Amino acid sequence: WKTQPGAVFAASPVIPVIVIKELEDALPLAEALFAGGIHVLEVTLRTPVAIKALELLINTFPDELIGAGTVITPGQFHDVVAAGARFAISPGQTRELLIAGQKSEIPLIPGVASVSELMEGLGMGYNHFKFFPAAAAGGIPMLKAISGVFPQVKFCPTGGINSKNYEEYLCLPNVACVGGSWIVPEEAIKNHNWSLITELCMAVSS
Amino acid sequence: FSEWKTQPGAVFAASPVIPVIVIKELEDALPLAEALFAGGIHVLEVTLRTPVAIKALELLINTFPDELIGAGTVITPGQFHDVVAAGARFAISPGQTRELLIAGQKSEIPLIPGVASVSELMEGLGMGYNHFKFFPAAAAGGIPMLKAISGVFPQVKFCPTGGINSKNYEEYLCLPNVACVGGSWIVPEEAIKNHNWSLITELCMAVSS
Amino acid sequence: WKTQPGAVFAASPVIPVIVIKELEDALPLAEALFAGGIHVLEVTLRTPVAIKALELLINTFPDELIGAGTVITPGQFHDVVAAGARFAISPGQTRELLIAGQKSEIPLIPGVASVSELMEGLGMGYNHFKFFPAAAAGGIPMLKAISGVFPQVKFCPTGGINSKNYEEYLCLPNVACVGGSWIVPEEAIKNHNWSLITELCMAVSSQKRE
Numbered sequence A: 001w002k003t004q005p006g007a008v009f010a011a012s013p014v015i016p017v018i019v020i021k022e023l024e025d026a027l028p029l030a031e032a033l034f035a036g037g038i039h040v041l042e043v044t045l046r047t048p049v050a051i052k053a054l055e056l057l058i059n060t061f062p063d064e065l066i067g068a069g070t071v072i073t074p075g076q077f078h079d080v081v082a083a084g085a086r087f088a089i090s091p092g093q094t095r096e097l098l099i100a101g102q103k104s105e106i107p108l109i110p111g112v113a114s115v116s117e118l119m120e121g122l123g124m125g126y127n128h129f130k131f132f133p134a135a136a137a138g139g140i141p142m143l144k145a146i147s148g149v150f151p152q153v154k155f156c157p158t159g160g161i162n163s164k165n166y167e168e169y170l171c172l173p174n175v176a177c178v179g180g181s182w183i184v185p186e187e188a189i190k191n192h193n194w195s196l197i198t199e200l201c202m203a204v205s206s
Numbered sequence B: 001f002s003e004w005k006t007q008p009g010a011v012f013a014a015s016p017v018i019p020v021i022v023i024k025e026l027e028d029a030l031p032l033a034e035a036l037f038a039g040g041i042h043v044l045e046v047t048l049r050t051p052v053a054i055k056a057l058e059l060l061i062n063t064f065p066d067e068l069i070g071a072g073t074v075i076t077p078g079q080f081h082d083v084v085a086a087g088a089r090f091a092i093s094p095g096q097t098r099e100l101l102i103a104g105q106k107s108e109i110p111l112i113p114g115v116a117s118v119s120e121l122m123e124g125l126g127m128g129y130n131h132f133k134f135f136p137a138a139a140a141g142g143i144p145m146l147k148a149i150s151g152v153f154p155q156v157k158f159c160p161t162g163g164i165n166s167k168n169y170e171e172y173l174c175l176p177n178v179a180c181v182g183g184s185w186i187v188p189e190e191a192i193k194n195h196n197w198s199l200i201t202e203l204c205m206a207v208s209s
Numbered sequence C: 001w002k003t004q005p006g007a008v009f010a011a012s013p014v015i016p017v018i019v020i021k022e023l024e025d026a027l028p029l030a031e032a033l034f035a036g037g038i039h040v041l042e043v044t045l046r047t048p049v050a051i052k053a054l055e056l057l058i059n060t061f062p063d064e065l066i067g068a069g070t071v072i073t074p075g076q077f078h079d080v081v082a083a084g085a086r087f088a089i090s091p092g093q094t095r096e097l098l099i100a101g102q103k104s105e106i107p108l109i110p111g112v113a114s115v116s117e118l119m120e121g122l123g124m125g126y127n128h129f130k131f132f133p134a135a136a137a138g139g140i141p142m143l144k145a146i147s148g149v150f151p152q153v154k155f156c157p158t159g160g161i162n163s164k165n166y167e168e169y170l171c172l173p174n175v176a177c178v179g180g181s182w183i184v185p186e187e188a189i190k191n192h193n194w195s196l197i198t199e200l201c202m203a204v205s206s207q208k209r210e
Helices: A004-010 A023-037 A050-060 A073-081 A097-102 A115-123 A139-149 A166-170 A186-190 A196-205 B008-013 B024-036 B053-062 B076-087 B098-105 B116-124 B142-152 B169-173 B189-193 B197-208 C005-010 C025-036 C050-060 C074-082 C095-102 C113-124 C139-149 C166-170 C188-189 C193-204
Strands: A014-018 A040-044 A065-069 A128-131 A154-157 A179-180 B017-021 B043-047 B068-072 B132-133 B155-162 B181-183 C014-018 C040-044 C065-069 C126-133 C154-157 C179-182
Touching: A004 A065, A004 A154, A014 A154, A014 A196, A023 A040, A023 A050, A023 A186, A023 A196, A023 B189, A023 C065, A050 A065, A050 B116, A065 A073, A073 A097, A097 A115, A097 C113, A139 A154, A139 A166, A154 A166, A154 A179, A166 A179, A186 A196, A186 C040, A196 B142, B008 B132, B008 C025, B017 B197, B024 B197, B043 B053, B053 B068, B053 B076, B068 B076, B076 C050, B098 B116, B098 C166, B116 B142, B116 C040, B155 B181, B169 B181, B169 C074, B189 B197, C005 C065, C005 C154, C014 C193, C025 C188, C040 C050, C050 C074, C065 C074, C074 C095, C095 C113, C095 C193, C113 C139, C139 C154, C139 C166, C154 C179, C166 C179, C188 C193
Parallel strands: A014 A040, A014 A179, A040 A065, A128 A154, B017 B043, B017 B181, B043 B068, B132 B155, C014 C040, C014 C179, C040 C065, C126 C154
Antiparallel strands: none
């Protein structure tokens, strides 16, 4: 790991959760994010073209922190490493995935939602996690309770984070950044509203 | 993995509501079953929550061999082997362990394990499971939890159980990743104790039609 | 196990979750707890002096049920056992910690927050658990739903339990006791407010019925 997990969190207060259904949208969406001050991109493995979109983004804009999300299996993890991803994010964790991230060249950010899941990740050497789905898995009260026992663990809450609540999450001492789709809404991507997306990103990156 | 003759999706497709059956008195098994059948419910989950449960399971399977009768509250591999040997057509669990998931993939009979977090779901997927009980649904994040999961695992199918009732079950059934729900409200212990088989049939008919 | 997990839960309706910053406060705090009827002490591994306080309390009061909390790792479990702890409590569980507790004469109370976590503990011989953080992880509805499927499993809910809600938790058939800092607030410890701590403990001791 040359890129440290903490670098995936320090890049932006908000990590955009990107769903790319059409490959032609990948590059103009990325340029819109860059113009809006966002230099970390999580390309989720949720569509057939996602791997090709990740490859296209890394080939075109290699000096951005472009990684993959929804990495569920070791096989997907090796696929995104091979595609050039700078990091891998998962909505949860498995033992196999945690093992795979130990010997990897790029950081894995596993997802957890209970103290035992956190402790399993900690035992494997991980101390940067996604908290997912944050709003449905206990929200701010959960993160405060965890902070009292694991003050040094750092989280990126994702899932139900939006304009109205994201500052409340960011203010927590164990929250390094948040993630969500509200700055890259699917409707604006589908309809090529790139300048709008820049404006939504500017509202959170300034 | 998951090449069972009886597929979990077929179990889920048989009824919008799987009744969570608690049988305390063996004499109640047949009339309770008749009330369910009459109310259009032909998938029965006999829970392993009472001393007579295994006997009631065996009695129901032997008496009604053409019905889709299985077991619930299957916690251990030993209990799973017990309900297989009793003739259960499926096993449902409120959660999962590696050993339980291993037992289900070694069996002719499908296992429907329980999950409540994304990591638990991911361990289940790693063992070839993609049909799960979500338990206890209402206390483990409810509809917002299921909606969040659907955006990330759109193919995974759930049977939410735990706090599902007449007033909210349709809200759960409308979700794209919910194939059916489970609950005791259509087989309530008060009606079973009173031998109120007409009421049970009426409750079942309301959800099956 | 020299002490049974159920004995840890049966000692008091409320286990005091102790954060001790100054070693000289350990003996006077114990006196305030004893005077309020409470003889189970959970010294949390959250301060530099916690291990030394644990050892001091056990050596001073060997006949009291003095144990450790916030035991995260097998290494910490071995440290508190060597320190003389009568029990160890964890906010969660891992396979490694469950294995370590199997090999000890000192009871381990793992923390769980889902049925699958409970089942992993059950499979390794555990049926007394902390439910943490109780108020944020599903609360009373979660415990009630679990009680129907695991009537043999006993819980100590901790995290967000206070004087306003603890009796509601205690009424549940699968809740043997609760844990909380509200009967041992850090401000009262720092200020040597033993009369307040004793008053708070006396209130929860009159709720002990077995």
